[PDB]
Specification:
This protein is α+β, with helices and mostly antiparallel strands and 298 residues long. The protein has helices at residues 55-70, 100-106, 113-132, 171-176, 181-196, 208-217, 229-237, 249-260; strands spanning 17-26, 29-36, 45-51, 79-84, 88-93, 145-149, 152-155. Bound molecules: the ligand Cc1nc2cnc(Nc3ccnc(-c4cnn(S(=O)(=O)C5CC5)c4)n3)cc2n1C(C)C. The record marks 296 as: Important for interaction with PIK3C2B.
Length: 298
């Protein structure tokens, strides 16, 4: 029927890693900054440790472990392992710049058209990968895109990934609970809108119960001021009633790539290009045996 999933679930000892501080806490649970020092390997891996004690909560986090351990792509977040304590912990890669939503709000005055369009390509690449792996995210939003470096983003939060966020949801999903790769494309359009508005809340003030009626009337998120009709038209195509009329993630990679080659023709930002963001070629970006998870293999 379907291919056997031969992904390895790595069980890590409590003694192999340390929590440093809390990175974030909320409805999603609690995420901690940490260091993973495996065996007698002479490596220090910067990690993020997630924990949602209740049997039903352990079931849900293990469902996220299942999906997260099964993905392997540069623009998707993979599970490093799990720790079996009183509460089951997920051990993941530290994304030092946090989520993209807060990044675009905090660094607005230094974010240019090249960065914005490249993030779009990268999110579409990650999403296309999930489509190839026959996985429907069901929760794509700017809050679920993490920043490794300002030039490298990855999709996370597999707590809803299968084979409620109303304001990011396709109309078929709100009305009929129908989720497809084409419903993820709707959420992708909303994610792009969030980036182009430098982290604006979609349909601010409007209660979730009113959204279904709003979309049925033909109302969509407005054209952001920096967006050319070329970029807005793409967002609009992601918000069509007919799912099959929406672009495919492979077409979004193409469209945004063409645009990323001449970003000033597609996004109009006051004082663009003169804008600078931290790079691994810049100053101060034990620390001796530190290795990123992307370089720490099997
Ligand atoms: C502020 C902050 N700094 C971080 C550094 N590194 C990661 N690392 C990773 C890597 C892969 N996945 C995750 C992850 C999975 N689910 N979530 S979440 O539920 O917190 C998501 C809704 C924000 C984060 N974190 C996460 C970080 N955060 C999050 C709390 C947003």
């Amino acid at each position: 029927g379907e291919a056997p999933n031969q992904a390895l679930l790595r069980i890590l000892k409590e003694t192999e890693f340390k929590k440093i501080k809390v990175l974030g806490s909320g409805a999603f649970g609690t995420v901690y900054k940490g260091l993973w020092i495996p065996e007698g390997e002479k490596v220090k891996i910067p990690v993020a440790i997630k924990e949602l004690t209740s049997p039903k909560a352990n079931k849900e986090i293990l469902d996220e472990a299942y999906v997260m351990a099964s993905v392997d792509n540069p623009h998707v977040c993979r599970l490093l392992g799990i720790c079996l304590t009183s509460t089951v912990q997920l051990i993941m890669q530290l994304m030092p710049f946090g989520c993209l939503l807060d990044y675009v709000r905090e660094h607005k005055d230094n974010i240019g058209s090249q960065y914005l369009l490249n993030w779009c390509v990268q999110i579409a690449k990650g999403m296309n990968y999930l489509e190839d792996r026959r996985l429907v995210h069901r929760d794509l939003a700017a809050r679920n895109v993490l920043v490794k470096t300002p030039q490298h983003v990855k999709i996370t939060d597999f707590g809803r990934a299968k084979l409620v966020p109303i304001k990011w949801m396709a109309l078929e999903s709100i009305l009929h609970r129908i989720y497809t790769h084409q419903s993820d494309v709707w959420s992708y359009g909303v994610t792009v809108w969030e980036l182009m508005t430098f982290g604006s809340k979609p349909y601010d003030g409007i209660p979730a119960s009113e959204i279904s009626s709003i979309l049925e009337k033909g109302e969509r998120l407005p054209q952001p001021p920096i967006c050319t009709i070329d970029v807005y038209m793409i967002m609009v195509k992601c918000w069509m009633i007919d799912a099959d009329s929406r672009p495919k993630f492979r077409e979004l990679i193409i469209e945004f790539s063409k645009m990323a080659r001449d970003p000033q023709r597609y996004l109009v930002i006051q004082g663009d290009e003169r804008m600078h963001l931290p790079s691994p070629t810049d100053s101060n970006f034990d620390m001796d045996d530190v290795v990123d998870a992307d370089e720490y293999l099997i």
